[PDB]
Amino acid sequence: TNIRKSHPLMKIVNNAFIDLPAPSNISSWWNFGSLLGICLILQILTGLFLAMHY
Amino acid sequence: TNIRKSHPLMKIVNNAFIDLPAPSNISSWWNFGSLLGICLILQILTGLFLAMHY
Amino acid sequence: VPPHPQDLEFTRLPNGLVIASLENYAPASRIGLFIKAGSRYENSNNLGTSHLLRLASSLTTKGASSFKITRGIEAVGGKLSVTSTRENMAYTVECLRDDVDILMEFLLNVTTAPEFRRWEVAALQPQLRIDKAVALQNPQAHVIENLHAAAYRNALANSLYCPDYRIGKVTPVELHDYVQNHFTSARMALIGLGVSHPVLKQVAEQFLNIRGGLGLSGAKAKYHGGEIREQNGDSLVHAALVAESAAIGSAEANAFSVLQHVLGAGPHVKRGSNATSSLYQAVAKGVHQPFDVSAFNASYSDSGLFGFYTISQAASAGDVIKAAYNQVKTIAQGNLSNPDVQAAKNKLKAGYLMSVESSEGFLDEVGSQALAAGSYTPPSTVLQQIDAVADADVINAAKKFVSGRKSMAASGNLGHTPFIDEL
Amino acid sequence: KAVALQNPQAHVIENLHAAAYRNALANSLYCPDYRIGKVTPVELHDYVQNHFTSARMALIGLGVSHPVLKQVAEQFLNIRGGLGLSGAKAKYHGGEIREQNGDSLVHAALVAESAAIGSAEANAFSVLQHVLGAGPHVKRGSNATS
Amino acid sequence: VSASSRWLEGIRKWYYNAAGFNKLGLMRDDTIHENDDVKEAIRRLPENLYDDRVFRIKRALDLSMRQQILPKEQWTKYEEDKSYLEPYLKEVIRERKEREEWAKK
Amino acid sequence: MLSVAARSGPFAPVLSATSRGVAGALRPLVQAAVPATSESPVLDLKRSVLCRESLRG
Amino acid sequence: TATYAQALQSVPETQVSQLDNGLRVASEQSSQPTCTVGVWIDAGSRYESEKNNGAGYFVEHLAFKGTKNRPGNALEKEVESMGAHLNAYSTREHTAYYIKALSKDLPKAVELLADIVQNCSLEDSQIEKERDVILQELQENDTSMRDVVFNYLHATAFQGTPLAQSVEGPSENVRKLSRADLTEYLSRHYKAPRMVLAAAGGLEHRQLLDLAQKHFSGLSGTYDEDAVPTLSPCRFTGSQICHREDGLPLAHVAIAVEGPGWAHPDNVALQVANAIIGHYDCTYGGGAHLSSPLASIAATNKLCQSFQTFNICYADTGLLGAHFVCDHMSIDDMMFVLQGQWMRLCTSATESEVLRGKNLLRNALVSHLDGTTPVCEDIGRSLLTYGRRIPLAEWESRIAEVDARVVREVCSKYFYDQCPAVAGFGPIEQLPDYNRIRSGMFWLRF
Amino acid sequence: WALVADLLTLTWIGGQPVEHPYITIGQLASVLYFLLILVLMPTAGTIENKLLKW
Amino acid sequence: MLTRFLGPRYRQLARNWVPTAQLWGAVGAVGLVWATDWRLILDWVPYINGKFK
Amino acid sequence: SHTDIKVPDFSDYRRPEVLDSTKSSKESSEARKGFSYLVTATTTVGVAY
Ligand SMILES: CCCCCC[C@H]1C(=O)O[C@H](C)[C@H](NC(=O)c2cccc(NC=O)c2O)C(=O)O[C@@H](C)[C@@H]1OC(=O)C(C)C
């Protein structure tokens, strides 16, 4: 049996960006959701390194 | 139909401390899980108010 | 002292329709449209159509949507029912005096303006399964259904419930076709209680005028005979043994009806030995443990099935059946006393009298009479007809059951249930 | 059963036997639905031990030796305690079973009692069957000689 | 029938061609927002319509992904645009409204 | 005395809007609940009997 | 056009007469050729005690088994040959024995009743036979989940009181009751001032009175010294009984609240609200479109197989609630919905639904009173309970009085923040905890 | 697009001092914004319905 | 287009929950008052004057 | 046989206004609920402070 589907944790990850069905159809205007995510972490990440000195 | 069960958010809350089946049996030694939770938030909460002055 | 007991008014319209009413003066009204549309009119290519039909009495009509029929009718606390037998369907509607206008309309819409919308009938198919399951929970339902399939080559052999293979398979056109070729004037009758003849007659002349179906006994039951056995591990063995008898309406049908009360047909005292029941007593002699028996008598427009129905422990099935049979044989041989027939006649008479005591049972009698005989026969004269049965008639009846080709259905653990040739 | 009953012949022949016989041969080669889940371990034990006995068994082998078979047979296949006769004897009755269904075609079999395997009359019947016809000998042919 | 009725028809034919779904092979009704009423009417379509609607929308979603369109001679010609879903949608709305109306008394 | 159903015996299904689906023709059974052991289910995959749309105050 | 109001006026008055026994003799004449006569006794099992429980039931089994002047067969043979029907029943408060018969057979009809009610033989050999039949009836009753759960509701709601007992008794009593136990319950309870000769059909009241005085004279020619058959009120208990059994395919639940009892005028209004919620069954045609919100939701989401509201009445108390049947994973939803409806009514009954409820109830009433038997039973029983016969018209007036406000006020009085008596049986693992069910008997919004 | 450009307008004005042209034009852009989202787009929608025969 | 909720029943539903909605504002006012120690409103309440002589 | 099922005696746990099998519990209905609700009302008044 595929552990990628029954493990309490992976489920979430499978549902997030692996098996989740998406429109064959979306275009570049749908990228800004990842970009906002990326933005959020990178912001959190540099932001933190500044806090070790600020 | 009971919205407390089908709403994406409440589900979680129903599963956490409303409908979740628990042993009719547990005793005081099982309280420290809430206490640790409480501890964690209260710590986060006073901790923050100190940071507005520290 | 109650009021003036009105007389029932009866009327044959030229187009064949029958209208009958009784001004009740009762607080509630009851109206039925009875139709020559039962399962006997189905055929080998459309079985179950009248079952599904029986269950579509609230799908949307032209003058009233599903939702409206339901809400409308319950808003006045009325009911809408449909009853089927092998020969008729009967849409019955009931409510308080002041509300017949609303119910009548609903009734006319269903019976003469059903739309049988493709999707509504898809959503209904599954009921056929539920409905049947609930019915088939009594062993008698299955027995009698098999009994009719073994007894008749064709019409009356049809089932009152949809064959599983048709479930989900009966189509909107089959429903439309079925209504329009059986729900016509010459095969209908409109009966009413708490209603007036003029109102009925107006409704009938304004709304119940259609023709284009068929008109005859659309086939005519061919009695065949034969037997159907279904092994099953029910705890007890149910079985019915029967032979062709007489069509409703003939004098011979009353001989049979009297025969049934001589042999026994249901108990009259709560938890009694069935002292005066001659079949029961005859089995009891030779048989220990639990069992039941009664004469079975079923008559149709152009045929009839008569005999008995026994329920017994698997091992005593044969013993129960043979004693039962021999009993009947004993009355065909001549062994019947006048005081015996006299007591039966009493049960029958008192019985009929009682059966049309309430309004739902009177509506039904008037309605079935209308369709079977195109007339109304008062109690005094049914009683008079029952008295006309001579002892010899009852004996010949028995002679006719005994010497006639038989039909048998039984279900249970059949290890000791005999086949017909072993009787 | 579902897999078997997918051929209309299976059901026909099963009904054929139930109509033809009062009792033994009328039994079905497949379990009646009402018994599904209802046959018990003791019924199995009882069935083996009263039918799987020496006097009703036979051991056949290919690529094996008689001595080996015989040794096995004498060492392992020696049991008795079942029954021994035709445990009933088929009573031919006759009758008919019809099942309406909306298959596309009508399958039907008409039959009468004939002869037990082994008798000379059984071969008469066997010959009769080849006179009337019993399966085709040429791929997609008119069944000329049938 | 007016000279100006052809004008309104002309403004409509104009918008249609502008709206553009026809280049993707869609039909007006293939582009309705799906809501309860619309979902129920989609449910009531007979097999062939439903199947055809599925194929259409698949063909568009496909085009839309390649960011192409159909050859001009295969676009949905206004006026050959079948309003296949309106009657059901209209009936679903009627019955809802009857309910809505019953709920007031 | 027509009315096949009520002349007892033949089956007669009733269906309804507000009331309950019935199968109530005639054969034995009442004289079987007396000499007892006629179980009957308690609302197995089923419905409900005696039914409602009758009452009082 | 003869109006409904007017129709109620046409129903003939029930004539009441008292003998010197104290035996009330009542009738409702009609044009019918048949009729229904019988005696209604103010005797049940709420009148019994721990040790003679099942006595009434044991008597019923003997009532038709033979009298002094008519031993064994005799009775049956008289009834059966005259083509009549002999029947009887008993609840926790009442007992009845009635005869359906050709109306020209009123004289012997009554004679037979008397004998039955007065000279019940109780031959010892019969008592023994009957002992084993009733035992069997119990094995049988054990399979009707419905009969079971209602006995459990009664058992728990009225715990510690006579009303908590069942009509048939526990097995040991049936195994232990003696002839002396029986006859003493008979003489104790079958006394004129607690009996009512009732009848409906083609009779004339005078003829009934004559008979009653001819065959019933001499029953209370002895008014008892200090035997004071008085019913002590019965405590109600907010409690819960769960008979878990995962071997049953469907679960039965019965929830109730304490009712007022036979005589309280609150019944009418409660019956209206009950009608609003109604009942359901999986063979009802018309699912999604039902007026009852509970019923419609149950049908669309397959919440059950059947449900039904009810209002049981006994003296000064009663069970008021609903009983349902469903799959093991629906017990929670059914309960929620059932309860949410009860509250909606307590706090938000709208006007039209109440009209529907009133009409339903009118229909019910009139429809129920159809035919000799149902009427006769209403006469006899009502005389016992209301002391009189409440003419249709009066009920119609009581119903008309009711409107939304009355429903909310009356519902709140009995349901709002009240303690339920819950009874469970079957695959009940998902049946909510009593606290939870209790919490569902009030709304935090209100 | 009129909305986008108009937002690009507000951005530009916001970037300027509260003086001559800049005041009245940024005052117009504001009204536009609210009138566009609150009246114009909702009406454009209805007209399109009507044009399509919806 | 909130016309779906315009009718006799809604009018009755609305009226039924009038006392509740009222008492529920009483709870909130007093609640806001007590929580912020509303100097303005409180001065009026007989007792509760922890700011007098 | 299910009629052998009596509910076990609870006198051992019952509030005193409820010990009598002959006394309607509706009389102490108000008093009993009142008390427990007063208990939580006070409680919550306490958390409030
Ligand atoms: C830690 C990295 C693992 C990823 C799990 C968390 C991240 C997550 O959930 O991943 C998937 C990728 C999620 N959806 C998409 O990207 C997405 C969805 C439809 C279409 C496209 N693209 C093009 O059509 C997409 O890109 C998405 O992009 O959401 C992020 C905001 C979220 O990030 C968050 O939560 C933050 C709170 C962590």
Ligand SMILES: CCCCCC[C@H]1C(=O)O[C@H](C)[C@H](NC(=O)c2cccc(NC=O)c2O)C(=O)O[C@@H](C)[C@@H]1OC(=O)C(C)C
């Ligand atoms: C914000 C408050 C809402 C609660 C949701 C979050 C909190 C949450 O999930 O709630 C339930 C209450 C969770 N389990 C229990 O308490 C619990 C479980 C079995 C038994 C007992 N007691 C006695 O037998 C318990 O008390 C628990 O107590 O976990 C906390 C650590 C968690 O807290 C957390 O996550 C933090 C990360 C927030």
